[model samples]
Target: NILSKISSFIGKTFSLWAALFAAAAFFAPDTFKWAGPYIPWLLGIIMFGMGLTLKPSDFDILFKHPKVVIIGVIAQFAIMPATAWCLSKLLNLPAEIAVGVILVGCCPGGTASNVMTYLARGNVALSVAVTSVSTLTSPLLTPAIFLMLAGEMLEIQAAGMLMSIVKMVLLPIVLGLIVHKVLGSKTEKLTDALPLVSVAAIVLIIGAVVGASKGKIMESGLLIFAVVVLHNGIGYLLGFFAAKWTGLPYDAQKALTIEVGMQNSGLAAALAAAHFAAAPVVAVPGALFSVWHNISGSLLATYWAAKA
Candidate 1:
């Protein structure tokens, strides 16, 4: 009973921390900016740990459930970016901000989705496959989506963005995968420590964005918060329906929802800062999304876990 209660409490605590971080991002914008640059490094470490947890067997699902993976990938690439484009137009945001929203949408599924899927009693392998495939494809898709959707709002060198994504996300993941293969059983301990590092990195990224936009975020804080919440919620809803439409099982549907809904905001922010003029605004949605999804995902997981 103690273990059961502990498990329940841990789920609640994750949600609480995520909510608190999001609130802190909005209310204490000045604090989070200081933590931004460290975000990518943290993510890389977490990803490396993720690699350690893997075996060749983890990828066997690719052959077993290719359809699930394919559907998840399709939903991730198509649904979220389309919704972001539509929402940006509806919100009548400034051109730069609109582009920022699209950039976040075009990013691949985040690492957090795997954890959320596991917690939600969903298909973790499907989630992992979706993330892996989506991320690998981001080098091509992210840039193409941005150019197609946000070209009028902003100028984007699709090739450059593709390279950046490769350098930042793909290459590191490949390296980690290789390390996992080499280290074998020794990698387990490192894999277990990854979540804590990832969580800390997220907090720092949020802080950095808040700090950078101390003035603008302060002035337009409420509006930005509202947009971010809507964006995240809609993505989740759309992801669920997309999976249902494809006839995915309940667990796969849940996994796809989390995978498609949550994005790698850190990657978006890094690209924006390196490539765009309005780095602060570009980082905002991602920073906000990071905090929001954790809260939403954790709560969903807890409710589902209880029902299960």
Candidate 2:
């Protein structure tokens, strides 16, 4: 019970911790440099925790209302990536940062969305469904979309990226699922405490990335901040409008709004660290993304909750 309370507190204060750790890393890169090499493993552990939270019934919403889930997933993949691509070109972002931005855009919906959806009194089931579907499809979609957009900027090895994603992201999730399946109800307490573990992993991941790019960050910090702000705001706007205009209910609208806005940026940061190690700055946007979206999502959720 104390662990559950601590987990809830940690989860609720995620953005604050994320911002603090990121700033700490930026200011004192030496402190977090040790985490740089462990980025992928950290993310894999987070994904494993994510999978532990899943259950057979989590997919029920997918089959029950395939149309709603399909619309949300399509909007998430299409809107975010295209918007990032155009914004990168418009801003004339450096190649490394552009790739980082696109990587965040191309990522699947984060688990944070489901929390925000619940806070917003939105359709949590729809949020979970969309998040799961997008993430499961990401091994194929993320690499293809990233290549299509960032190919000119970088010589993308799509195949290599795909394999890496599978290894780092999907495989760990599968392992979590198998463990959860075997353990069943025995995993309840562990699942409840996983949010704390995930938050810690994410906070450290951001710290590692920010530390890696500390020097480059001072040069383009404000620029990346602007891009992440605009990118995240536009996602919430387009995703909400897309759902509202499609005649979805208020709950589904709220779910879609949060889903599209909050990305799995930790995964993006890990990919950048793994694939674009040549340009440490390539991981900066994702770090900023992890910071910004949670803040924005929390604000938006608070607004919606008060309205309800």
Candidate 3:
């Protein structure tokens, strides 16, 4: 019963576990240093789980209320990137740090947002569909946003990031979807097990990145953290107002709130690690975001969950 309780706690409070591990990794670099090599693969694991969770029906899943989802997606891409770019400029973050912030913004809605939406009594199905569509759009959206806005910060090889997307995002998702289709019932066991595994993979990724970037984190930690807080907070504010402005139902508003507010920071971190490998600091925003957003999202979900 203790293991069961602990297991439930770990699964339910993934944000807590992630933040704790990130702190540990920041303190003891060598302990998790080896994890750096598998950063991209860890993301693949998460995206694969995304594919398994996806349904073919999820594509048109937004059909009932296409306008709200479209607006949310637009807000997702527009507001967040604009937020990051502005923060980077306002704070005068270094080029690598600026790019780091921008890259996280360029990512899609986080899969975790779907869970938060469900917790908030929001539209879970809509959350999943939004997440999927946003991710599928990333191969095009991410590179363009990064190149256009963060050009001063770094030489964004959009093609390289695109190639990484194909391997890291596209291929893994395809494999997971194909496996589910062929194996069907046989894969049911893994499906149930995926959330925990995916959480662990993500925690490890944040740990690896934190471990590797410990020194840089210390150097720019305060400013980076301040900007990160603002980026996420402003995002939540923008999302809520956007949904309210569009006249959505309460449930859909909550879903849009979370979807617009969170980023697939894992994907952002992976791209930073792969394409911007030379500057570990460039991964810091994604790394910090990977920890912070979950805590924020969970807390927000709890608040919205109790709403009448």
Candidate 4:
């Protein structure tokens, strides 16, 4: 029954595990801490599974629909970061946490975009291309954008940070891609299982961070929650308008909006943990954003599904 239920679930939707993972983080943070450090491993597995789902033709979306892919990428890079910078400043958050907010914004489009784009009935190939390009570009653009915008608030070694990203994020993804290419269709079966694994990993990550900072969260929980919600909502709004200004179709606009709004917060957390101290407030926004975006994205996706 459980297998049947799971199979049905996967067929009907994408990111079921991510949703579960975020929920677990919110409700049962204690249990997830043990699983937290393993989050990057889980993400790597998920990305590799994604590679398995791809063929060389997935890359051909660039040649097939150059305008849509380019617009989506530009919207992702521009709207999200600008909105994060403006909101972080407007909210007058602590400097470190503000940098955290900007860090998530500067990061690339999340892998979740492919799922969300499908749910919204958007261009899946275009979404895949955009996510891949954005992720590849992140090692350079993420650090540069952070240094340019949040350097006054926080010290940033752009080059060093880029290298760290390469080590933690880029390397794992490349490895996953390689594995997928080698394994071919053998990896397809694993794709169904990946959602479950990814969800578990993310939930563990959220729980671990929240558990470690239980006291801090208790003291500033309300304020932090408020800031996180505002940050995510603004991303959606700005992203929607940015796509519209570029004259994207409704589906493409929705894809851009989702891509821009949802960040790969797990990557943000890993970077923060690697680069900053234990007390690093830089990890806080990533942790919080990890939770907030899932909740918001689920609601938005459900709304769009009904409209569709």
Q: Number of the top candidate by lDDT?
A: 2
Which pairs of residues collide in model 2?
none
Give the alpha carbon lDDT tens digit for every residue of 136-168 in model 3: 889889888888888844454666888898888
Each candidate: RMSD to true structure? 3.4, 1.3, 1.7, 3.0
In angstroms, the error of model 4 at 189 is 1.9
Candidate 4, clashing residue pairs? none
Worst 10 residues of 1 by lDDT: 3-12
lDDT of 4 by residue, 1-308 (tens): 69758856753443455456545655666666665566556556555555556567777978888888888878887877887788777878776677677778788877776877788776677778888888878889888887888774345555667986776667867776777778877877667676666655665666666655665566766676777788778878888888889888888778878888888787777676666646645666777887677668777877888899
Query: Which candidate ranks first by TM-score, i.e. highest?
Result: 2
Off by over 4 Å in 4: 7-42, 152-157
Candidate 1 regions with alpha-carbon error over 4 angstroms: 1-40, 152-157
lDDT of 1 at 306: 85
Q: Candidate 2: lDDT of 15?
A: 82
Checking candidate 1 for backbone clashes, the offending pairs are 32-207, 32-208, 33-207, 33-208, 33-211
lDDT of 3 at 92: 84
Q: Is 1 or 3 the stronger prediction by lDDT? A: 3
For model 2, give the 10-residue run with minimal summed lDDT: 152-161
